[PDB]
Structures are given as structure tokens and as C-alpha cells.
Amino acid sequence: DYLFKLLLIGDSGVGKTCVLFRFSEDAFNSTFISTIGIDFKIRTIELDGKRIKLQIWDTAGQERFRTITTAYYRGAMGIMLVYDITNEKSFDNIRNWIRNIEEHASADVEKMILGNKCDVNDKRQVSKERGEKLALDYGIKFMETSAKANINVENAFFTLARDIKAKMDKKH
Ligand SMILES: Nc1nc2c(ncn2[C@@H]2O[C@H](COP(=O)(O)OP(=O)(O)NP(=O)(O)O)[C@@H](O)[C@H]2O)c(=O)[nH]1
Ligand SMILES: [Mg+2]
């Protein structure tokens, strides 16, 4: 059945690993252990009766693997651009990521922005409408997710996968 590669991209500690863990194993680890070695996961979804194998590449947020993370753009097909709603600096840094993808990844790559840590509204620094407006500016999808609270985690991955399926099916 169909195989889609997926990139989780963002600053260190936005919750990329936790987002993949909630998608893969429907669980949450309150601990923060930074990703060093880029590791992929296969998560099988069903879109309109078709099984699609999502090869999800969980990249390291640390600056010393920027050059290493970028190398994984080849054949990526889809990229989750994750920032932390409680961290404007991470949100400011997704502009840099989106720009890097436009220049270095293929034109037909599908992009979505996730406002992660959406459950923690108390420490919110980034308004939902500021993420929506940025997504609108670049003409890409956006939704607020919580890996901890399991909000829009499946929805985000099904939304992105559909946009990849739609472009792929239209080639015929
Ligand atoms: N409240 C809350 N905390 C979250 C959520 N997602 C992740 N976190 C927390 O944020 C921290 C970083 O999560 P992690 O998945 O390791 O982030 P990362 O972006 O993969 N980090 P790195 O790029 O360095 O590997 C952890 O303490 C984790 O529990 C979420 O949806 N809600
Ligand atoms: Mg990670």
C-alpha cells in the first residue's frame, strides 16, 4: 500500500518527539529527552478505505544538527512545522524553517504548521490567530495540537496525508 515520508521540523523542545509518540503509540512521556540521532517511525492510517504507511522522521531541534536535519528534505513529501504556543521564539523560528524548505525542499512538498502545547493556555505566548495568520500568509494549513492532551494529533497527520494523497492522485 501507499508510503508517505513525513518530517517533524522545529526548535528543540517544541514537542516533535512527543507529537510522534502520541501519533505512533497513543501515549505521552512527561520527561524531556532531546533527540540526537534522527529516528523514523511507521504509522499506518486509512484515508477513504486506502491504507497509507506514514514514514515519520523525528528530527533533532538542537542547532548543531541543523545541517543534518536539512539533509532529510529529499523525498520528504510532507513536513510538520511544530512550534510551542508557550514559546514565541520557537514560533518566530518556524518562519526561518518555512523559508529554508521553500529554498531547499521541492516545490510539491506539503507543509503544515502545528501550534503544540495547546493544552497549556495559562503560559500561552502565541495567539491561535497569529499562527492561523502566518499559515494564511504562506498558504499552508495550521491547527493547535497537544501531544499530552491528545488534541488534533491524529487530525493533523490525516489532514497533511490527505494534501499529499490529493497532489499524488491528481498526477493521473
Ligand atoms: N504540556 C505539554 N507538554 C508537552 C507537549 N508536547 C511535548 N511536551 C513537553 O515538551 C518537552 C519537549 O518534548 P519533546 O517531544 O522532547 O520535544 P522535541 O521538540 O522533540 N525536542 P528535541 O528536538 O530536542 O528532540 C517535554 O517535557 C514534553 O513532555 C504537549 O502537547 N503539552
Ligand atoms: Mg525530537
Author numbering: 6 to 177
Sentences from the paper on this structure:
Upon attachment to their target membranes, Rab GTPases act as molecular switches that are activated by a GEF that catalyzes the exchange of the bound guanosine-5′-diphosphate (GDP) for the more abundant guanosine-5′-triphosphate (GTP). Once active, the GTP-bound Rab can interact with specific effector proteins which mediate a variety of downstream functions including binding to cargoes, enabling vesicle formation and promoting vesicle fusion to target membranes. Rabs are inactivated by GAPs that promote the hydrolysis of GTP to GDP and the inactive Rab is then relocalized to the cytosol. Structural analysis of Rab8A revealed that the PINK1-regulated Ser111 site lies within a short stretch of amino acids within the C-terminal region termed the RabSF3 motif.
